[PDB]
PDB file of C-alpha atoms and ligand atoms in Angstrom:
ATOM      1  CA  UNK A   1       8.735  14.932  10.543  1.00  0.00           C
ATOM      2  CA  UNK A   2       7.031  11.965   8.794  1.00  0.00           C
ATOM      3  CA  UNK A   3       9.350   9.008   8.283  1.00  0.00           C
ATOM      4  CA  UNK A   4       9.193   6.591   5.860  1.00  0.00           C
ATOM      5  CA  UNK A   5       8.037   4.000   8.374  1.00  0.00           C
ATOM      6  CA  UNK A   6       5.136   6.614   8.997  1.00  0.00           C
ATOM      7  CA  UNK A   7       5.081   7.211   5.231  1.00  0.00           C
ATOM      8  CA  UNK A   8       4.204   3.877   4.525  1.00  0.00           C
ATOM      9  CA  UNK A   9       1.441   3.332   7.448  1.00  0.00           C
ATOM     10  CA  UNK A  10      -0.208   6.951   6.001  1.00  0.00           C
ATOM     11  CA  UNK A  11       0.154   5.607   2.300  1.00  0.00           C
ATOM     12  CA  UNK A  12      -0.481   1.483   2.786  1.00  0.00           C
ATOM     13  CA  UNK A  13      -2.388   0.560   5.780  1.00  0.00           C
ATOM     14  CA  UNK A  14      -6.111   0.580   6.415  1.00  0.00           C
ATOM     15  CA  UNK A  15      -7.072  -2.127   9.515  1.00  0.00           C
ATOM     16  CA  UNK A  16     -10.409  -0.269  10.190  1.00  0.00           C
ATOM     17  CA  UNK A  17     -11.917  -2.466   7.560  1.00  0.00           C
ATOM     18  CA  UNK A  18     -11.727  -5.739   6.384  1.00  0.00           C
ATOM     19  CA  UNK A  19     -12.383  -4.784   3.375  1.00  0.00           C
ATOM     20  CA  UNK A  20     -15.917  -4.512   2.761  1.00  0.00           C
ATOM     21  CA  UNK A  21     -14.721  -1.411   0.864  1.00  0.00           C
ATOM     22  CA  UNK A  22     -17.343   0.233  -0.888  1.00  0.00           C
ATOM     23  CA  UNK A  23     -17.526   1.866  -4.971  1.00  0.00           C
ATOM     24  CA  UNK A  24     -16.595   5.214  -2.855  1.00  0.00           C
ATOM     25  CA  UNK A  25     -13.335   3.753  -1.115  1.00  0.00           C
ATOM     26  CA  UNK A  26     -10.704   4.804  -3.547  1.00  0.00           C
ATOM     27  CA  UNK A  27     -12.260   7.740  -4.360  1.00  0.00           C
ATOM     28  CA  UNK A  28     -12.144   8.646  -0.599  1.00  0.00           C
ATOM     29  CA  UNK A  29      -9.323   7.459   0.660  1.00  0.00           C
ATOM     30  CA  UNK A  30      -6.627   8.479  -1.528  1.00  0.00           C
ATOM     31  CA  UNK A  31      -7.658  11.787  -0.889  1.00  0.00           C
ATOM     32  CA  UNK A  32      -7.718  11.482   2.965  1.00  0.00           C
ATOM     33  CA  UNK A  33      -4.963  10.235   2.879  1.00  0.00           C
ATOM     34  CA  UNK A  34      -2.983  12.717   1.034  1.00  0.00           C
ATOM     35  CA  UNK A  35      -2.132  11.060  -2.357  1.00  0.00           C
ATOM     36  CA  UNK A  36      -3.699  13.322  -4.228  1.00  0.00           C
ATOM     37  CA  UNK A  37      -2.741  16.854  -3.173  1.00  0.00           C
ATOM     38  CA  UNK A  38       0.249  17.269  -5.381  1.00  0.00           C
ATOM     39  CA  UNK A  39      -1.077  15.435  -8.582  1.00  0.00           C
ATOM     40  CA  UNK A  40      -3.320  12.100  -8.809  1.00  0.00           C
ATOM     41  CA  UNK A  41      -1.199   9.077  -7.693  1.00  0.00           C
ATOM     42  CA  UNK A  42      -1.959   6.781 -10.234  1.00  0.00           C
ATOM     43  CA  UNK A  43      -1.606   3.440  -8.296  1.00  0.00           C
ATOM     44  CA  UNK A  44      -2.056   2.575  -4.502  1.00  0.00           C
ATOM     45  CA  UNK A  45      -2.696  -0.244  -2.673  1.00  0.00           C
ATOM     46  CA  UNK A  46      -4.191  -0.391   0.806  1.00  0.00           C
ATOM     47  CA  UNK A  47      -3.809  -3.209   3.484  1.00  0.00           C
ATOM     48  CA  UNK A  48      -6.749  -4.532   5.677  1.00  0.00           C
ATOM     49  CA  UNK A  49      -4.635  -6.103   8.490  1.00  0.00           C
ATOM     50  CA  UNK A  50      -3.239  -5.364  11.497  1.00  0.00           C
ATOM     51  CA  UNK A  51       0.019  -2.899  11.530  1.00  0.00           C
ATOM     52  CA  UNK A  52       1.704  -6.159  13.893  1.00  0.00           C
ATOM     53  CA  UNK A  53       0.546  -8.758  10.800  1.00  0.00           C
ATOM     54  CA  UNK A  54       2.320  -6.511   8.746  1.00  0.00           C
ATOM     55  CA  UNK A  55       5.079  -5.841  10.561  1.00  0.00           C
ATOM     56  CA  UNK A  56       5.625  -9.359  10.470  1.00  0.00           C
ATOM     57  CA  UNK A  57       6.241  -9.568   6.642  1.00  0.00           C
ATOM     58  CA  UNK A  58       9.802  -8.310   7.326  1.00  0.00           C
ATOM     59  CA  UNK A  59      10.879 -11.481   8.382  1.00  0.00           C
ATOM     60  CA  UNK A  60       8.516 -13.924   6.227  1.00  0.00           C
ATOM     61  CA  UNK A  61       9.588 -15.089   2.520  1.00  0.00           C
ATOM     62  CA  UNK A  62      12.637 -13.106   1.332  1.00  0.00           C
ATOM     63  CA  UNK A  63      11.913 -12.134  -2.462  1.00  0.00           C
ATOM     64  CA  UNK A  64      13.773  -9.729  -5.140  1.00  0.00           C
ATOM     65  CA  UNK A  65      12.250  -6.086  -5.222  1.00  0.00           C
ATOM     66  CA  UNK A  66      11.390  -4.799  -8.725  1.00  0.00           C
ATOM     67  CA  UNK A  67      13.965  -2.553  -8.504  1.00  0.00           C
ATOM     68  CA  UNK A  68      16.523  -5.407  -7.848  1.00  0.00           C
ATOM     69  CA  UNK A  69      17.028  -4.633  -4.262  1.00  0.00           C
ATOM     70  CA  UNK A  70      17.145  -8.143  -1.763  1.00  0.00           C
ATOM     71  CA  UNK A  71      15.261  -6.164   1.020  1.00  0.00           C
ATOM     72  CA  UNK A  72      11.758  -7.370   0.169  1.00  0.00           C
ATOM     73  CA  UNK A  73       9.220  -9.977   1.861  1.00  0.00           C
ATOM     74  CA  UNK A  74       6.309 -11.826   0.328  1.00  0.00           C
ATOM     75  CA  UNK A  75       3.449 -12.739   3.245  1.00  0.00           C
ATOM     76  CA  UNK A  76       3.452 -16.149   3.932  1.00  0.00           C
ATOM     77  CA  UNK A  77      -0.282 -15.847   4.068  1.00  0.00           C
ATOM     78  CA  UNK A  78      -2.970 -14.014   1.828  1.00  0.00           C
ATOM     79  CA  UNK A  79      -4.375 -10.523   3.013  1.00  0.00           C
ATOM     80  CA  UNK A  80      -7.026  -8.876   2.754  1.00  0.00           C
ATOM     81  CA  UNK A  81      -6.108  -5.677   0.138  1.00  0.00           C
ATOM     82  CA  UNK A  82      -7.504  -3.016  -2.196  1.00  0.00           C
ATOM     83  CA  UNK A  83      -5.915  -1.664  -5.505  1.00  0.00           C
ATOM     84  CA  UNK A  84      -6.901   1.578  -6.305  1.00  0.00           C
ATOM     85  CA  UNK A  85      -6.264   2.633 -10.086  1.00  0.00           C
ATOM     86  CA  UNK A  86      -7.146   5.822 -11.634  1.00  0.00           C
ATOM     87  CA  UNK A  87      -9.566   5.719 -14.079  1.00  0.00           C
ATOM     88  CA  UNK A  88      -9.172   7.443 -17.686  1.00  0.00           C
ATOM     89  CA  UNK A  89     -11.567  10.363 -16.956  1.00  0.00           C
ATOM     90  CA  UNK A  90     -10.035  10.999 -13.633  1.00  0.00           C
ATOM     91  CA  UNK A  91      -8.584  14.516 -13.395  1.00  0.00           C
ATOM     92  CA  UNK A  92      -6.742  16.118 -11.247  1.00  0.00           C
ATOM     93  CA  UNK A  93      -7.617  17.801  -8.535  1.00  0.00           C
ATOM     94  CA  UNK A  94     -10.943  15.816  -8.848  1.00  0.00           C
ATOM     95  CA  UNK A  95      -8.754  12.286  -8.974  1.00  0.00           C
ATOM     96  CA  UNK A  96     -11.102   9.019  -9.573  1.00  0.00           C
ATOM     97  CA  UNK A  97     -10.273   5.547  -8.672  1.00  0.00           C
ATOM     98  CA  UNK A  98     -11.557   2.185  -9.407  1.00  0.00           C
ATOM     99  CA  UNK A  99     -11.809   0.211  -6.597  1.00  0.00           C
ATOM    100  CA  UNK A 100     -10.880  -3.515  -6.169  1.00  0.00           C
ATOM    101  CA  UNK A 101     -10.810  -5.986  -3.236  1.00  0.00           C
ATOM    102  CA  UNK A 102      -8.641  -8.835  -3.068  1.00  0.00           C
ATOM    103  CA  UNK A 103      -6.568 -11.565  -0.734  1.00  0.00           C
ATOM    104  CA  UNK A 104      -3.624 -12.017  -2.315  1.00  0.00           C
ATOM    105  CA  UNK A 105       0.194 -12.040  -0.680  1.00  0.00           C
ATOM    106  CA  UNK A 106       1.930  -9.112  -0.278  1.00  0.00           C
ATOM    107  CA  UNK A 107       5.626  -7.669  -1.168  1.00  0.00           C
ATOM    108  CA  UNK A 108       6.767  -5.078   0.872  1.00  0.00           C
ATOM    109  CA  UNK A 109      10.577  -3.823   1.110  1.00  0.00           C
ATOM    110  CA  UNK A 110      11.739  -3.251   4.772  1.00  0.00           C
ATOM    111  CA  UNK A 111      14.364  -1.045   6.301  1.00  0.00           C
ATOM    112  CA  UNK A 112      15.570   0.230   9.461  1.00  0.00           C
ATOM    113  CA  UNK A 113      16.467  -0.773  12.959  1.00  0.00           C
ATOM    114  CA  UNK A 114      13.460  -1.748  13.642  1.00  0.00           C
ATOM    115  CA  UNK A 115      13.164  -3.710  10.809  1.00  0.00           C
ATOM    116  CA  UNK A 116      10.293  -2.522   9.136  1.00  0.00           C
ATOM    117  CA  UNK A 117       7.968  -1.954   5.990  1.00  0.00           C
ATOM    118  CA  UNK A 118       8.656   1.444   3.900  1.00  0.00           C
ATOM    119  CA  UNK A 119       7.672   0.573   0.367  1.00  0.00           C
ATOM    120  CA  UNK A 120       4.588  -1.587  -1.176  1.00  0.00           C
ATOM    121  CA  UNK A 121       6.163  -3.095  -3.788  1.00  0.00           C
ATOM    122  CA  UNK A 122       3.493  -5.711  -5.358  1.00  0.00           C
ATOM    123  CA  UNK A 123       0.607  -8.376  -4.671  1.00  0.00           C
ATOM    124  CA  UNK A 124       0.356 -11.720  -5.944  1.00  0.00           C
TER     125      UNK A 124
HETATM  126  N1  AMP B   1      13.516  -2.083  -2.276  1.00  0.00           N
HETATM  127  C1  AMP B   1      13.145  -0.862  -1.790  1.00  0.00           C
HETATM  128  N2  AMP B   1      13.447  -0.397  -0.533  1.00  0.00           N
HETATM  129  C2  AMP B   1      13.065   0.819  -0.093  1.00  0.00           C
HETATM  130  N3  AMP B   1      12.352   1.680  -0.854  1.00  0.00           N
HETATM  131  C3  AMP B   1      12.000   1.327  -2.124  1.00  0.00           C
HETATM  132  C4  AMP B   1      12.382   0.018  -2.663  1.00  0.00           C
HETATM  133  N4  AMP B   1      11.911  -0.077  -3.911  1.00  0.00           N
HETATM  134  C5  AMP B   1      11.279   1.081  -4.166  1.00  0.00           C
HETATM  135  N5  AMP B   1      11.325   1.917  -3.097  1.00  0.00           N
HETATM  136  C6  AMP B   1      10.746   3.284  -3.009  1.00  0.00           C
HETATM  137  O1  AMP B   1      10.055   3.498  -1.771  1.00  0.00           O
HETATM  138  C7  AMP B   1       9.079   4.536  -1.961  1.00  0.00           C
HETATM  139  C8  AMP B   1       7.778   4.145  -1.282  1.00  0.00           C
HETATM  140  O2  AMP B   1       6.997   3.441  -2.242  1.00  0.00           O
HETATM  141  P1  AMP B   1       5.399   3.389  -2.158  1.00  0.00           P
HETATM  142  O3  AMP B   1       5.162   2.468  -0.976  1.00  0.00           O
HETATM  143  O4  AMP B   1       5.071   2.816  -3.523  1.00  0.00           O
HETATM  144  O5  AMP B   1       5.002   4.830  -1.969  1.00  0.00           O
HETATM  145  C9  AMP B   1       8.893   4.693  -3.474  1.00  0.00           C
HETATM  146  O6  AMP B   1       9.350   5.982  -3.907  1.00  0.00           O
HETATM  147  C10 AMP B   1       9.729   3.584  -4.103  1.00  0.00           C
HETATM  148  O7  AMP B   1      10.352   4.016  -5.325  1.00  0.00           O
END
């Protein structure tokens, strides 16, 4: 079975690219990835880095979640990301996503022995 360490690689990381991601990215990868079988997931965010950089956020700047957990970590560096939003005329099954590149910090909430990332909580 798929745990939510898994869960969160399958959902959140993308180090093929560096994030030269093209018009089509979105569009692509949330369905290749599997966030669209069930209904259109209306935000996701992707990180160009390596699974060890990220890793690695689980012990960098200890912030509050948005849900008011203490179990979240803002990167002490930026990263290259890209936010995926569904557009208005998307429709599922046929979901459509704007595409948008950025370096910014990430916030990821970590659990587990090994301590690691399960939930993509924000960028800033
Ligand atoms: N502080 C947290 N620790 C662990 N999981 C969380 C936390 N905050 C939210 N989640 C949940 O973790 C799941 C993975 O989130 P996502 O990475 O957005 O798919 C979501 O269902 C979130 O609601």
């Amino acid at each position: 079975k798929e745990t939510a360490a898994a869960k969160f690689e399958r959902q959140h990381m993308d180090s093929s690219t560096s994030a030269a991601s093209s018009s089509n990215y979105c569009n692509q990868m949330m369905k290749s990835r599997n966030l669209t079988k069930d209904r259109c997931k209306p935000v996701n965010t992707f990180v160009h880095e390596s699974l060890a950089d990220v890793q690695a956020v689980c012990s960098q700047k200890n912030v509050a979640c948005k849900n008011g957990q203490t179990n979240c970590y803002q990167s002490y560096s930026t990263m290259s990301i890209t936010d995926c939003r569904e557009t208005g005329s998307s429709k599922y099954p046929n979901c459509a996503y704007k595409t948008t590149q950025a370096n910014k910090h990430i916030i990821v909430a970590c659990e587990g022995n090994p301590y690691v990332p399960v939930h993509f909580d924000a960028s800033v």
